[PDB]
Ligand binder design. Structure first.
Ligand SMILES: Nc1nc2c(ncn2[C@@H]2O[C@H](COP(=O)(O)OP(=O)(O)OP(=O)(O)O)[C@@H](O)[C@H]2O)c(=O)[nH]1
Ligand SMILES: Nc1ncnc2c1ncn2[C@@H]1O[C@H](COP(=O)(O)OP(=O)(O)CP(=O)(O)O)[C@@H](O)[C@H]1O
Ligand SMILES: Nc1nc2c(ncn2[C@@H]2O[C@H](COP(=O)(O)OP(=O)(O)O)[C@@H](O)[C@H]2O)c(=O)[nH]1
Ligand SMILES: [Ca+2]
Ligand SMILES: [Mg+2]
Ligand SMILES: [Mg+2]
Lengths: 428, 334, 437, 54
């Protein structure tokens, strides 16, 4: 299986989504025209995973852009790689979702969703062998969160044997738009637990902290946060995009990473951590990459890895380096810290190497972990949800769109089940 | 930081070894079933040798030699001595022995019993100790399992004062390179009650086991005479050293037993590495002839010596493979 | 002359297939285009090599081979590779989507829809056989296709060709080069289902080959290419007696007869010597004594285990190069007095020896140096059960928490098949115990 | 000691040396298994689609 269909929803979804296509396009040698101007053949070998060929010979991203507002999509279209997207893959309403999950999922989103599925079907039909879908969205707003999870439900109904994966941005009070973000996040998680196969948890708390503590940026913008996201995203999709042995498609990644169907929320990690523009001149040694990629301070989800156990780990090393030194360092980490890797999944750490480094670095490592420490992320959202929900505060925004309190109670309970299910395996 | 697991709870020797390994702070202990160890201090029974040395990036080591039971079960030791060209029936430091079953060499045993009956020369045997043949065979089928019939040593050396029997325990460490190391300290395990040539029924004056004694404690603390004292004695009474009259023979026996099984048990070209501590039990007769009693695969030490020997185990068996940031052993040269 | 069909399943089976056939061509002087100048009977023959190669009127020698993968990438390499001309398109069979490292997906889901097509293309080769003796099956234990499709294929071959012999070459999983955490599951499931359908299986542990490549070839990080050239040398040692004139192991039936007294216990250990780097500048050539002695070193074995602590049921020595019986018997006499070799009571202590005078062929510019003499030992020893013990422990660890089981249940397999497969392995481990001490 | 069964040809030779003497499922049942599994997958899918219809 080859083709992945990419969907980006809402302001956050479309902003990280645009950056993703920007970064991977440069790696595959594709320019704003859709014209290849690269040297290596490794660049084109698996280009069909993400790109359509339309005679030119031009490469068109298999990408559908979705919003309930036109704003951020006009931003994308007049942005750097804006011309590359298929204009018919732009699907927008006018009325917005007002950071309201109920509007995205039930009222405004319901009005727009069929048009999105027409574009999904049109893209799915040109595929030799569709692998499945990736979605970029946030959980804190209304469109990416409410409408994004509506879309996932409808995509699963029409394609139940395909893999569904998400890059899901979790909200934090540190970088926050509205007080209702915990409501929107809890309702979205409930969906994600049932209808995705694999979810990369991108924690805005973590991205903020990395920017503040490590990159010495005193006031991080979304741009700074998204630079970390696009690097992580390029990293986690390396094995899908380039010639390679393991985690080479979406189903094989799921089979190695997900021991129990509900526990499919991954903590990504990246090394070296770099800020935008400002370059680093000294390449990292393989021992340094390996130490940094496993460091809590390189994690994109604000969870302490020492507070849990790793179920499974995938590690991707990028650049020209010694594969023998990689195996040794990877083996050294596990042997040194063996109590943090569950002993009932043997050889639960898999490593891949790709020759092509990302732009502006000679060496990089990407970490994908399924840790039971992710539970800290869900506990945090749960705490914020309950603080409001016990006084039913802000609920009228949701009941006004037809929702009952019961739906909140159920979504909370399911998220608490997920928490305690993680705790079960951290002690087994 | 080196790692290790512990799979034998009842081992005083290894309890002390781990305690020492922890106290260097360069060794970390893991849970029983974590496969990511450098060192296994394993179980006595059914040790999973098949699962060792298949962990990439880990040099693995275990404190047992697979196949050393050929030396350490009484039935197996007899078989090993009789059938190996290096030892043979011709062997002169092992008592005449026969292997006997209930539902085998019962036939060949009774044949040698009658040549003893010919000249009526001392015809007493062990299994537990009897004068007449058919009273031993009737004890055998009464019990269940397999056991050995062995010529009993009717003229032991007897310590004065007190007309006392004894046995010598020697501790031997065989490292991963198959160097054979004899711990310089041995121990004599003495009888307290005088030896009785004409009554084998009185059993605590004939069997020297440290448990079976507890007359106990009379002449030496806990029925344990150490080396300096026994040497002093042999000089004073018999005008000879421990070295000349006994230890030359002991060193010879130890090296013969262990050179014999070396091709069957060596881990020299294997994917994992082994060491083992043995306890060799020796009897000395009245002419100062040394006889091998048995070989113990999982021995305990003597209280006074736990510290020194356990430290040596760490020094020559463990740190030799896994070095950190004089000797108490005599190397037996083969 | 009696024909053999080779069946190569999944990535491992296909890539190893490529290496074997590459080597076969070099050994028989068959060119990339498929022409064989030294063959004088144009268009036919019943020479020993025709066991493996059929012929066309144009004089093309074509492998009696079928390649099957559930995904196209790897078979597409064969299709457009240097041996593109050798194979008929109908012999190269690909699906669209693979088994995703899942036994149940390879066996139940995707197996179902391709099994009839594969068996039909096998039938096309069988129809051209005057006297088909049976099958050589190459696959991994660890892959979804290698494990899942193979076991289904084996069940069906027993049905359609019940009289015919089936031999396996099986890649046993190693973490250093493995692609999936579920390989232990796939291995046990495929072994259970395949056990009755296989007459003789040669296991090759990737760990053992990986380490041979590191220690003896000085390869820092062995690739599949390194591993496969070594594996194909061992396979060619094993099949040489089917492809060359001789009186030992001349048909598939003789493999069971000579190597397998007890039908369930059908996994002989292969040991190979010597393995010598081609960029070793100065090499002192090894004698018959030295290479035969090396057959008793664990480091030279296809599976790391300890034959001193099991019992032998049979032992064949297969020499290539300048070797004469006298030097074999002399080497055996000396080795017998230095090593622990214990046969079971109900078998003769002894060796079946075969010598082919042509030294092993090496692939030009490959990793292996040309040697004057080499040997492959095939021994049926109980010690190989150590490899089952390892696999079973790993299976038990994951299954006790039912980790990943939902992937298999979701493909239509019942949970009970896990516990059934594991029970058969417990019985197998027991059989080896009873034979072995 | 004893060498037996010696066979020689142009290509090589074989022999035996002795050191010491001694002392299926049907086509129908397969079709059945593969269709049972298909039915279990059909049922799991129909359960999922019912739940999505709710
Ligand atoms: N020795 C060797 N092992 C291989 C090779 N290719 C894969 N393997 C091993 O086989 C296992 C993976 O199985 P594959 O054969 O790749 O899987 P497959 O049969 O193609 O099945 P799916 O891809 O799951 O459909 C792992 O243990 C690999 O290390 C090869 O060329 N040589
Ligand atoms: N052939 C013989 N002649 C004289 N005395 C003998 C003997 N065999 C055994 N003994 C005595 O009987 C005791 C029996 O101990 P033995 O070593 O045979 O078995 P065991 O396992 O109970 C003691 P350990 O725990 O040291 O192995 C010895 O300490 C020794 O004093
Ligand atoms: N990391 C990141 N987070 C964002 C970005 N834009 C918005 N957010 C976060 O996304 C959430 C609001 O959702 P948004 O995508 O703007 O609303 P929507 O358009 O209705 O889906 C809040 O948690 C914001 O902190 C962005 O560009 N990057
Ligand atoms: Ca011909
Ligand atoms: Mg917004
Ligand atoms: Mg495959």
């Amino acid at each position: 299986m080859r083709e992945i269909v990419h969907i980006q929803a809402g302001q956050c979804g479309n902003q990280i989504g645009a950056k993703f296509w920007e970064v991977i396009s440069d790696e595959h040698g594709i320019d704003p025209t859709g014209s290849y101007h690269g040297d290596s053949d490794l660049q084109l070998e698996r280009i069909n995973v993400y790109y359509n060929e339309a005679t030119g010979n031009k490469y068109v991203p298999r990408a559908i852009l979705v919003d309930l507002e036109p704003g951020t999509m006009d931003s994308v279209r007049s942005g750097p790689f804006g011309q590359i997207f298929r204009p018919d893959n732009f699907v927008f309403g006018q009325s917005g979702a007002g950071n309201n999950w109920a509007k995205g999922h039930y009222t405004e989103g319901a009005e727009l969703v069929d048009s999105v599925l027409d574009v999904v079907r049109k893209e799915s039909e040109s595929c030799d062998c569709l692998q499945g879908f990736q979605l970029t969205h946030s959980l804190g707003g209304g469109t990416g969160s409410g409408m994004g999870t509506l879309l996932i439900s409808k995509i699963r109904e029409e394609y139940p044997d395909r893999i569904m994966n998400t890059f899901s941005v979790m909200p934090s009070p540190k970088v926050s738009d509205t007080v209702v973000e915990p409501y929107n996040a809890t309702l979205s998680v409930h969906q994600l637990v049932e209808n995705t196969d694999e979810t990369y948890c991108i924690d805005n708390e973590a991205l903020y902290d990395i920017c503040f503590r490590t990159l010495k940026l005193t006031t991080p913008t979304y741009g700074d946060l998204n630079h970390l996201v696009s690097a992580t995203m390029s990293g986690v999709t390396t094995c899908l995009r380039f010639p390679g042995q393991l985690n080479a498609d979406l189903r094989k990644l799921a089979v190695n990473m997900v021991p129990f169907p509900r526990l499919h929320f991954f903590m990504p990690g990246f090394a070296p951590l770099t800020s935008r523009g400002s370059q680093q001149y000294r390449a990292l040694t393989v021992p340094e990459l390996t130490q940094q990629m496993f460091d809590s301070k390189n994690m994109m989800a604000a969870c302490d890895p020492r507070h849990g156990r790793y179920l499974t780990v995938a590690a991707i090393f990028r650049g020209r380096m010694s594969m023998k030194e990689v195996d040794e360092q990877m083996l050294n980490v596990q042997n040194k810290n063996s109590s943090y890797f569950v002993e009932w999944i043997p050889n639960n750490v898999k490593t891949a190497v790709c020759d092509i480094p990302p732009r502006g670095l000679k060496m990089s490592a990407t970490f994908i972990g399924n840790s039971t420490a992710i539970q800290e992320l869900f506990k945090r959202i749960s705490e914020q949800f309950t603080a409001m929900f016990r006084r039913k505060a802000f609920l009228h925004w949701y009941t006004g769109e037809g929702m009952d309190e019961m739906e909140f109670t159920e979504a909370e309970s399911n998220m608490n089940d997920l928490v305690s299910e993680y705790q079960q395996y951290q002690d087994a | 930081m080196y790692t290790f697991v512990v799979r034998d709870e009842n081992s005083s020797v290894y309890a002390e070894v781990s305690r020492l390994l922890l106290a260097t702070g360069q060794w970390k202990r893991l849970r029983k079933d974590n496969p990511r160890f450098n060192l296994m201090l394993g179980e006595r029974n059914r040790l999973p040798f098949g699962r060792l040395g298949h962990e990439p990036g880990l040099v693995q080591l275990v404190n047992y030699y697979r196949g050393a039971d050929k030396l350490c079960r009484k039935a197996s030791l007899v078989k090993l001595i009789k059938t190996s060209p290096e030892l043979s029936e011709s062997c002169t430091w092992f008592p005449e022995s026969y292997v006997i079953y209930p539902t085998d060499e019962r036939e060949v045993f009774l044949a040698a019993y009658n040549r003893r009956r010919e000249g009526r020369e001392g015809n007493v045997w062990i299994a537990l100790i009897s004068s007449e043949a058919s009273e031993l065979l009737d004890f055998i089928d009464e019990q269940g399992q397999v056991h050995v019939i062995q010529k009993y040593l009717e003229k032991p050396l007897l310590l004065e004062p007190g007309h006392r029997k004894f046995d010598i325990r020697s501790w031997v460490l065989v490292d991963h390179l198959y160097n054979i190391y004899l711990y310089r300290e041995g121990v004599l395990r003495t009888s307290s009650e005088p030896y009785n040539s004409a009554n084998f029924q009185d059993k605590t004056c004939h069997l020297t086991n440290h448990c079976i004694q507890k007359n106990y404690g009379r002449y030496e603390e806990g029925n344990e005479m150490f080396f300096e004292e026994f040497n002093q004695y042999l000089m004073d009474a018999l005008n000879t050293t421990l070295e000349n009259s006994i230890l030359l023979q002991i060193k010879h026996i130890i090296r013969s037993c262990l050179m014999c099984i070396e091709p069957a048990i060596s881990t020299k070209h294997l994917h994992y590495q082994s060491f083992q501590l043995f306890g060799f039990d020796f009897m000395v007769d009245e002419e100062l002839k040394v006889w091998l009693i048995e070989v113990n695969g999982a021995p305990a030490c003597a209280q006074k010596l736990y510290a020194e020997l356990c430290q040596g185990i760490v020094d020559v068996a463990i740190s030799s493979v896994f070095p950190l940031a004089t000797s108490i052993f005599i190397k037996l040269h083969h | 002359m009696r024909e053999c069909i080779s069946i190569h399943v999944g990535q491992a089976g296909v890539q190893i297939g490529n290496a074997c056939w590459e080597l076969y061509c070099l050994e028989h002087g068959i060119q990339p285009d498929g022409q064989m100048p030294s063959d004088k009977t144009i268009g036919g023959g019943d020479d020993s090599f025709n066991t493996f190669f059929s012929e066309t009127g144009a004089g093309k020698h074509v492998p009696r081979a079928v390649f099957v993968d559930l995904e196209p990438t790897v078979i597409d390499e064969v299709r457009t590779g240097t041996y593109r001309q050798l194979f008929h398109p109908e012999q190269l069979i690909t699906g669209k989507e693979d088994a995703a490292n899942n036994y149940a997906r390879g066996h139940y889901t995707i197996g179902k829809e391709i099994i009839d097509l594969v068996l039909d293309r096998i039938r096309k080769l069988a129809d051209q056989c005057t006297g088909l003796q049976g099958f050589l099956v190459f696959h991994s234990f660890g892959g979804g296709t290698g494990s899942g499709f193979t076991s289904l294929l084996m069940e069906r071959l027993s049905v359609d060709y019940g009289k015919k012999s089936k031999l396996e070459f099986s890649i046993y999983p190693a973490p250093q080069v493995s692609t999936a955490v579920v390989e232990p599951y796939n291995s046990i499931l495929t072994t259970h289902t395949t056990l009755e359908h296989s007459d003789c299986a040669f296991m090759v542990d990737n760990e053992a080959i990986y380490d041979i490549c590191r220690r003896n070839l000085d390869i820092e990080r062995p690739t599949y290419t390194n591993l496969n050239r070594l594996i194909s040398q061992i396979v060619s040692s094993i099949t040489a007696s089917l492809r060359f004139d001789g009186a030992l192991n001349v048909d598939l039936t003789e493999f069971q007869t000579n190597l397998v007294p007890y039908p369930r216990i059908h996994f002989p250990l292969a040991t190979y010597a010597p393995v010598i780097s081609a960029e070793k500048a100065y090499h002192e050539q090894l004698s018959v004594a030295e290479i035969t002695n090396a057959c008793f070193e664990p480091a030279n074995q296809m599976v790391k285990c300890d034959p001193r602590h099991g019992k032998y049921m049979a032992c064949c020595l297969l020499y290539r190069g300048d070797v004469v019986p006298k030097d074999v018997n002399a080497a055996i006499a000396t080795i017998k007095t230095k090593r622990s070799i214990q046969f079971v009571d109900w078998c003769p202590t002894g060796f079946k020896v075969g010598i082919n005078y042509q030294p092993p062929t090496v692939v030009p510019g490959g990793d292996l140096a040309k040697v004057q003499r080499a040997v492959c030992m095939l021994s049926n020893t109980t010690a190989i059960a150590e490899a089952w013990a390892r696999l079973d422990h790993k299976f038990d660890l994951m299954y006790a928490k039912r980790a990943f089981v939902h992937w298999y249940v979701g493909e239509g397999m019942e949970e009970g098949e896990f516990s059934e497969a594991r029970e058969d392995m417990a019985a197998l481990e027991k059989d080896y115990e009873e034979v072995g001490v | 000691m004893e060498v037996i069964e010696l066979n020689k040809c142009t290509s090589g030779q074989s022999f035996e040396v002795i050191l010491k003497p001694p002392s299926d499922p049907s086509l129908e049942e397969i079709q059945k298994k593969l269709e049972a599994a298909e039915e279990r997958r059909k049922y799991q899918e129909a359960e999922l689609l019912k739940h999505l219809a709710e």
